């Protein structure tokens, strides 16, 4: 199909800013990047987030051998060498 191929080419083929003439080849993260050229506003935005993020509560629950003692506030077993 004429359409199907283009859709695949947007996803698959370099549908990214690997275009040409001074760009950002590689970028990473856990989520995305709310941002502008002014690093001052960015830091303001970052610190406001640290202050605003909810606790461990907001985070992804995990079943770890250790973290188990965290979900039950106080516990302990073997602490450190």
């Amino acid at each position: 199909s004429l359409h199907s191929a283009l859709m695949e080419a947007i996803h698959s083929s370099g549908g990214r800013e690997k275009l040409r003439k001074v760009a950002e080849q590689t970028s990473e993260g856990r989520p995305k990047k709310p941002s502008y050229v002014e690093a001052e506003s960015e830091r303001s935005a970052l610190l406001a987030a640290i202050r605003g993020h909810s606790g461990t509560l907001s985070l992804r629950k995990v079943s770890s051998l250790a973290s188990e003692e965290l979900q039950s506030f106080r516990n302990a077993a073997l602490g450190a060498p």
Partner: protein, 371 residues
């Protein structure tokens, strides 16, 4: 061989060559003509100026803004802009290159034909194509399905897109965007004890906005911090050297996006508008909208907007629903970049409308090569 991509915004026109990673030309969408018909100690022959020199010569001209709220309101003015773009800015021959143009969501069918008429009859283009701005954003981030919030100078849209096509019924227009914030920022600075009102003072505020403003994850708590300390305070270096101090205004400004009551608007809020669109789609595709909510346009450029969006939508959604917000650092020119990618793909090369196809079918062929 090389395509042209022209993204016409209400504020700024962005132009350049497909395959580049950025536009070569970015200028104000402004046409200026001399006030008073015949007479002048004007200049050479120039019955018109476009972009910055129109702005510089405001004092001799009557200025017009042809593309108000994303929709063209004068085709003569629009033709002046495109003319300027090809010859003055990119310095190419229209008739040598296929050209891709963009349009706002919910663009009247009349206008879509006019765009095509002018491109072939006035500018003699070998080929051309028309793309919905919002759709190109999505493409720029390697996706063909999702919802994009595209907010610029004059208007904001949430646009649900499925497998390449925008969904007209679920497109919501939010009558609030960049220049409502510029204005709002002036208001709250005036209140503080400063004074901005003149259209030159505006351009100053607009610079503050783009440099100092940000979105707080928790607005109330941030208001609390700003009230009980001066740690959030920054001072801005003016042209005439009058160093101005700005506090809680930095974040109360972009907050208007989430609380339009700050603007005397009874409206909805970008996060709630996004949610309402998602809800206007069929239950069976909503998941993909949630997991692919894309941000584009200068007004989405405030740092911290993404995490906040994420949190605001999660608060409206069901449980466990994977909410992913994509806000790339280049999102100001996502629409253009998307355009550049598309037109430079080989699978796109037969998608174009050719001169030949136009000669037989006429302006209305554009409908067949879109929705």
């Amino acid at each position: 061989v090389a395509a042209l991509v022209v993204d016409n915004g209400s504020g700024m026109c962005k132009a350049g060559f497909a395959g580049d990673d950025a536009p070569r030309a970015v200028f104000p969408s402004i046409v200026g003509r001399p006030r008073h018909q015949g007479v002048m100690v004007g200049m050479g022959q120039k019955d018109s100026y476009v972009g910055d020199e129109a702005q510089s010569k405001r004092g001799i001209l009557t200025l017009k803004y042809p593309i108000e709220h994303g929709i063209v309101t004068n085709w003569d003015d629009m033709e002046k802009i495109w003319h300027h773009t090809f010859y003055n800015e990119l310095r190419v021959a229209p008739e040598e290159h296929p050209v891709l143009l963009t349009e706002a969501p919910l663009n009247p069918k009349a206008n879509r034909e006019k765009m095509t008429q002018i491109m072939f009859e006035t500018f003699n283009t070998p080929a051309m194509y028309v793309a919905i701005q919002a759709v190109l954003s999505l493409y720029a981030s390697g996706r063909t399905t999702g919802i994009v919030l595209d907010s610029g100078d004059g208007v904001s849209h949430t646009v649900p897109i499925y497998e390449g096509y925008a969904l007209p019924h679920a497109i919501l227009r939010l009558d609030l965007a960049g220049r409502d914030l510029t204005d709002y920022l002036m208001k709250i600075l005036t209140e503080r004890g400063y004074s901005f009102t003149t259209t030159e003072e505006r351009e100053i505020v607009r610079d503050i906005k783009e440099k100092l403003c940000y979105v707080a994850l928790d607005f109330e708590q941030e208001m609390a911090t700003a009230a009980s300390s001066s740690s959030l305070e920054k001072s801005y270096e003016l042209k005439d050297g009058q160093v101005i101090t700005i506090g809680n205004e930095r974040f109360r400004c972009p907050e208007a996006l989430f609380q339009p009551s700050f603007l005397g608007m009874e409206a909805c809020g970008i996060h709630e508008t996004t949610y309402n669109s998602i809800m206007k789609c069929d239950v069976d595709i909503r998941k993909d909208l949630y997991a692919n909510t894309v941000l584009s346009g200068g007004t989405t450029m405030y740092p911290g907007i993404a995490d906040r969006m994420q949190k605001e939508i999660t608060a409206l959604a069901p449980s466990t629903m994977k909410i992913k917000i994509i806000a790339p650092p280049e999102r100001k020119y996502s629409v253009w970049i998307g355009g550049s990618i598309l037109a430079s793909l080989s699978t796109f090369q037969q998608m174009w409308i050719s001169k030949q196809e136009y000669d037989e079918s006429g302006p209305s062929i554009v409908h067949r090569k879109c929705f």
